[model samples]
Target: AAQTNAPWGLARISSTSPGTSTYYYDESAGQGSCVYVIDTGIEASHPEFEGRAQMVKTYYYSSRDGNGHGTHCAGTVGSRTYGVAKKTQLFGVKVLDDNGSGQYSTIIAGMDFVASDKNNRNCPKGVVASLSLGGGYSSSVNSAAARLQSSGVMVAVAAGNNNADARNYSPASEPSVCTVGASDRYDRRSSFSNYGSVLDIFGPGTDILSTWIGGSTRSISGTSMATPHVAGLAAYLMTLGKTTAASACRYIADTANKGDLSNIPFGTVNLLAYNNYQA
Candidate 1:
């Protein structure tokens, strides 16, 4: 059975074209997997989480998410009511401040936190990380992301929202990390989405509705929104043996729906991320 009534983003991924509202997914999509959401923070008490979300790391702030960015990202990753992986564990790694700003050093600390967990014997099966934050190119940041990828963590990162070449961004430009651009419901590239040869694929990123702070929900837009969608999909794939980061990365890039998105920037791959669309 499929999730017949779902968000447009989820519905779009399960089908080749975007006309219906059904999102077909395995009942146990991420049963044995987990996702680390490296962002502001999450509201663990949000009802949408169904008691399945928490804050595992606090890089530069409190467990409280004054900014709802992380909560929103977490929702798209694994909320029972509005997510991709229904059963995966989600950990909040707050790298940014309440104002949605942070230093690269802090962000690297968050990555280190995930690495520590990656080396441990917990969280059961596959591990996927969703990073919806980035800035201008930085060698140190790229190196950190590279280390995570090397350590078997499937990291999905957001391309910058500058509407320019993604190569100018930090983690997004890193070849070792899985970079993602943004598209819309109409199969058109998001005007604010960064693109280029560096992108692995695009995901629905405009006007997405998801969980928020105070146990509520909101709608927003950005490559940030798109990154978690891919992360959740990768988590789903992890439950089916694409456990390693390398394997997950290859599966996503190879299985994407190609030549579907319109207005893709020149030199960028026109592949849109698909959640195992079954013709």
Candidate 2:
């Protein structure tokens, strides 16, 4: 891994920029990294992105973000004021419609799109995909993620918001990707977050502030919000030379804040807490 020259406390997502109050990691941002948000889509014209966010229409879906879910998640992933890797290249793949609906095949295609050369061109180092949608288990999606990982693309998936065992969910239960759950500002697991052995990590999802469609911003809650935190972190890790999907996952897991929450199941689930102090 590449060594950082900044001090330990300052080498993180510091709050030295505009409209930020909390200390976060945006330093090594995503200057040379790319993150693919496989959801509704993204508002590429959003000022927060400063024209850096890119949009690609999937085979069966339009890339325009009619709904705000994908934009909000994109903001969390790489928006200037509301993102983790602020400078990271953000791409939106529309798998869902305005009503936030899609089929498993659509999602698999989105994953395949990221693994292709089209998205990799802008990001020669690597690419990471953040998925905020989930349904029943699909072997196709799981295999797609694995294939992308083998091709040097990392995928971060939401563990679902059903508040049940995440093992019963799709990509979350799938062994190929990094599965994330929802946590609040206090690092407590959100009431709607899924749990069990399948969850790989937890991130700030409750009342998360991020960019929305139509050049606006909003605060929303769900594992969907949490997934981007990890994705952004993965992008940042890529900046540190953790190029492969498996290496990014390992670095994210090894440097996480384990058991840092104050809640019961949150601290007991063996989930890695999202820590901005470390890479």
Candidate 3:
């Protein structure tokens, strides 16, 4: 059900080398946390993800895997091989299918399943739900977000990557959700990442490397990659077991490796300093 599309130490890019994983080791591995990946099905058997995903839940809204975006996305978020914290369990919930898109109703349905899993005593604890897809802010999506929180599921949504005025999108625009924007080694927002007040935090998404379908690998760039970095980081915080999503977010913004913090709105991002760790 869950898989790994490891980006650390496997990229052919200029700035790729155990970026996210380095922080996990600094704090401690994600030993007791489980994150939910609601996207296209995973190549659960892939080496990167093999034995990494201990649980699986599916809601197939389509019947194709032609474009492996979701697969790659989930792989990086919690894929065993590329995962920052391999000990954490990943529950892959298939809301989108091979077609690369799904209906709003289908998306909500998959979310309902996640919400239910949150309160089910049999489910994994310290769970965080990360959604890399969103549309224009709408009441239905807003309501679904409410249900997820009420059900005790922590949620993270990618601020749509339109690069326009992003404050008007659905899940990102929702006040209850933490909206994620993309950033590179430099502190400026990724050229494609939507930014505004809704932009809550940023992560390494540019020139990302992760798993592809059919046991292969490739490099792609998008705020999508950035979203999971935060998701994985949030999972790391969840593993600490004392901080809430809001607090962890602040911790991330304070401690993450933002390249040039001195002149930016948030200043240079330095995980070693902000998280109180030695480099």
Candidate 4:
């Protein structure tokens, strides 16, 4: 059998200018790399993302006209000037529309499609998948998350902005998913962000500042905003040799801590602690 790659060979940081920094770091250190991003369709024509984004697959659950949500999310994940995984290749899927909402079935189809695709000369290289939008969890979501993990695909998802239990979302709350919560400027859990045992790790989610299509940049709210932070971390780990979802998830969770959970209404936060040891 082929040998699996070990972890911690690369350094991953959350930012809008990931391409420049990540590329510099990789080239400076000299390492082989690739990453897969699963989010709203990116701005294929935007100056920052245009030729840089890999158009592996695209689907729109709602109208595909030009909703700024997915575009903003895309920019935040990987924009030319500011990105967390700029050096990382992107695989886009429009499960949500301009309004920033989608059904579970639509996302499931996209996941299954990518998970089933084999590495081909024409297919995008890498097995990492990053999700920046999330809702409550369900059985369908669980099946999809587990299927992807079983197939050796990493699933990174937002922990939701409802500020409720971290286990609210089906797939995000599932053992197979790397449930990511959000932290604010002070490294505190955002009031609007969710928390609970299901939350595998935390990332920069509150007052997050990043790039937007059309050369616009601004700070956004919600765990959705913070999702890319962890997504970028996943990509970084992938570049460093962490390939499977479980391994990537473990790294993030094991490395994360309860930044803001302690100051919240609860006495402390563990269930919501970002755990990298286990998904």
Candidate 5:
């Protein structure tokens, strides 16, 4: 039987089914596009990914995920069952260590690795770097995001789980990158998600189910969970030939499913990122 409840992110973007969503599920969808999960590595052999994930570079340790955060985020980005860009190639860039902690230099190094041109590693146009981690503002991290954006990479960063202004964080506060906030199943802004002018978009984050380490599935929450939906959506758009990072951002902002949020002080909260594709 075809999946019904799975892939809620895909349904949120468009009602089209992955099995028949011609514009995104066809042979051309995300064929040359790539999404890099810059986190605690990925379980490349996870069943949900169907061996689509690749570990290109590891800055801290072995590219195998021990904390499980990276694999979960990767599942949301490219898993065949749980992702938005179901056919996109997935890459794991391990900046965080087994404990899911890393220095700004390590994270920047991972970004530099992906931004570098390589025949077998680099994506065709540009890659979407899905960052599910954040901390105090780091100029180096922000500069890395800007540099990668200028080189055509779309950096989707989590707006932190701080429940405060996202502007206080690193890559999320950084201009030019897409700062993502968390939304619940009800489409309301998650109580734990940070907000403000720094927030670029909102994604389904509460209780998100995705592939995990040890070839299992788990439900997790955080703005970290939300970032990949936007990243995967960006990759899906790229498959449709939305090449530049700015172009992808423009399309997402232009077609976003604007929703009402009560608790936020100011600034419009565009809840769900939407894409219109012919069926």
Candidate 6:
């Protein structure tokens, strides 16, 4: 499918600017790409997956998503009904728990899983991941993320929801990860999203509707939600020529809508995410 009547976040990315109600993607889409939704864990049987999404690793978390956060992020990345890259193979890595809490050590383990998975499979051209959880700076977490990127898995990370400088956050502050903040439909920064120099791009996050833990859907908000939007876009780019983490990142930054957002905090970049929708 070249396009779909999309959810707002998807619609926003496929347009030259925000405010579109459609998502235009390459016919190839993210067919060869894989996305690791590293959070509480995804309800793989959620109808949105239709058998494509799988849980690859469960690190320090209980059963499946008793919390809805990870599932929602997975949906935003690639669910049949809510995906940005509709054809991507989505994998879930359970790092956080039912309470949506995780330790830095476990988070690093989850990142290691992505790295190991990429290498063990002989490494393909388009494997990407999005981390939707955040805490203060941690060198270990930062190093793990960097190592994952070095292993050819592009990681998109949440700037955070504290409305503070993102540089103060761990994975967000890590230059090796693409840090994403939240924006609303009006092209304004989401009031709760962290900001500042560490942020690489912004994505529609407020009131985002996506697949939930059960076989249902839910509308959620946070920089966490915004993160997977960029992650999905990064995968879509990987389907084209942007194979490496650096190349996909450059394409994302170069194609993003410029200065289209309001309420941007000091030191934050003005670019908003896009999916190369050339009209």
Question: Considering every candidate listed, which one attains the maximal lDDT?
Answer: 1
Write down the worst ten-residue block by lDDT for model 4.
Answer: 1-10
Global Cα lDDT for candidate 4: 0.57
Tens-digit lDDT string for candidate 4 (80-147) = 44455555555566666666666788878777866776253132323556677666668887788778
Q: Candidate 5 lDDT (Cα, whole model)?
A: 0.79
Runs off by more than 4 Å, candidate 1: 277-279
Query: lDDT per residue, candidate 1, 1-279, as tens digits?
Result: 378678889888788896678888878768878899999999989988887788887866487788999999999999986798988888888898899989999998788779888665355668889999999999999999988888889989999899999998989999988898888989999999999899988988998889999989998999999999999999888886754667786788788898999998778998888877453
Candidates ranked by TM-score = 1, 6, 5, 2, 3, 4
Cα displacement (Å) at residue 178, model 1? 0.6
* TM-score of candidate 4 versus the correct structure, residues matched by position: 0.77
lDDT ranking from best candidate downward: 1, 6, 5, 2, 3, 4
Residue range 28-48, candidate 5, lDDT tens digits: 556678898999999999878
- Superposed on all Cα atoms, model 4 deviates from the true structure by an RMSD in Å of 7.5
Error of 6 at 133 (Å): 0.5
lDDT of 2 by residue, 185-235 (tens): 554678898887767777777878788999999888999998988898888
Model 6 residue 215 CA deviation (Å) reads 0.4
Per-prediction TM-score: 0.96, 0.87, 0.79, 0.77, 0.90, 0.95
Residue-by-residue lDDT tens digits, candidate 3, 1-279 = 122233442221112223332332333445567677766766666677767663356555433334667667766666655554455666777777676676878788878888887555242337677788877767887788667756666677777778855568767776666567665544445677776666666665667777787878777777777666666666666675645644556566565444532222333122211222232
